Amino acid sequence: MYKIVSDSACDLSKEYLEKHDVTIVPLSVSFDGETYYRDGVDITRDECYQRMVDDPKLFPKTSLPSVESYADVFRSFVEQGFPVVCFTITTLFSGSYNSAINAKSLVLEDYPDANICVIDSKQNTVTQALLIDQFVRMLEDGLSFEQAMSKLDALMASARIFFTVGSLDYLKMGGRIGKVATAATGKLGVKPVIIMKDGDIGLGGIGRNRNKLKNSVLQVAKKYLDENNKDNFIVSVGYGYDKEEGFEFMKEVESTLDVKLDSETNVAIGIVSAVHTGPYPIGLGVIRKYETL
Ligand SMILES: CCCCCCCCCCCCCCCCCC(=O)O
Numbered sequence: 001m002y003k004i005v006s007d008s009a010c011d012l013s014k015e016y017l018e019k020h021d022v023t024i025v026p027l028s029v030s031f032d033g034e035t036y037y038r039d040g041v042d043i044t045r046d047e048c049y050q051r052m053v054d055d056p057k058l059f060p061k062t063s064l065p066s067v068e069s070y071a072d073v074f075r076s077f078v079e080q081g082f083p084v085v086c087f088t089i090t091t092l093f094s095g096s097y098n099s100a101i102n103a104k105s106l107v108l109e110d111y112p113d114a115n116i117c118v119i120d121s122k123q124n125t126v127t128q129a130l131l132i133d134q135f136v137r138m139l140e141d142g143l144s145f146e147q148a149m150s151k152l153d154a155l156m157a158s159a160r161i162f163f164t165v166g167s168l169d170y171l172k173m174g175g176r177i178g179k180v181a182t183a184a185t186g187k188l189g190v191k192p193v194i195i196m197k198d199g200d201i202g203l204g205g206i207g208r209n210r211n212k213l214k215n216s217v218l219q220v221a222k223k224y225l226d227e228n229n230k231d232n233f234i235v236s237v238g239y240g241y242d243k244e245e246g247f248e249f250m251k252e253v254e255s256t257l258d259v260k261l262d263s264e265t266n267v268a269i270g271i272v273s274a275v276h277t278g279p280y281p282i283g284l285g286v287i288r289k290y291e292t293l
Pocket residue numbers: 027062063064093094095096124125126161162163164176196201237238239269272273276277281282283284285
């Protein structure tokens with residue numbers, strides 16, 4: 001029996017965490033740059049979105065989890081004899097992974113025969129949730145840790161997020177915009193269609209109208225799924241401030257792609273991503289079914 005751990009960027013539902021025994025190590029958010037609140041623990045996802053929606057000039061800051069936060073979780077499981085597997089947001093967005101690496105080392109000092117595996121998921125939000133869920137599936141289906149790890153690279157390489165946001169303001173201010181900043185996207189009124197793959201974000205298209213942008217998101221995903229064998233993928237949706245739009249989007253996804261969503265890994269996009277996307281991200285994530293690899 002493994003104790004699966006993730007940082008809070010994965011956005012897995014309360015229900016999922018209880019059902020599959022996944023433990024979350026929270027990132028923090030600050031609105032004034034002085035006081036920080038642990039994601040989901042000291043503040044709720046809905047409250048954070050509200051602060052941003054109420055104040056379009058407010059740019060909050062995120063902070064990686066402390067080494068001690070990871071260490072206390074690792075330690076409590078390890079002294080019970082549990083092997084630990086810990087997933088983090090992509091190292092290209094956050095130093096979360098390296099906090100966990102330092103925390104593993106800390107715990108080893110006091111428990112030299114401890115089994116702790118730290119994984120740079122190379123994902124975020126929906127695809128981090130999809131990857132964790134593939135791992136949860138493999139272990140529940142009776143694969144050994146080694147058998148599951150032998151599929152990890154291919155799973156991570158196959159993951160994609162296809163999404164759009166309300167503006168470039170938060171991405172630029174938060175420093176992770178990277179290749180999504182171009183001459184075209186810098187023009188007044190334009191929003192990007194964004195693709196997350198291989199641990200980072202890139203530009204998949206542009207537009208101006210919310211509904212047209214969501215249609216472009218779907219067309220970009222459809223091309224990828226068609227190329228790679230749609231039947232062999234799990235598909236889930238992530239939504240931001242407007243839950244109704246999210247549910248309606250899920251219908252468009254199922255209709256356009258001719259799939260049924262895996263609802264367990266649908267996510268209300270969390271604070272970690274929202275601080276950087278703004279309160280209006282919407283999109284879908286996909287990942288290969290391990291069985292097909
Ligand atoms: C369907 C899901 C759509 C939302 C996808 C958003 C994923 C990529 C957007 C960029 C996210 C940057 C997050 C950086 C978090 C930094 C945390 C920290 O301070 O260490």
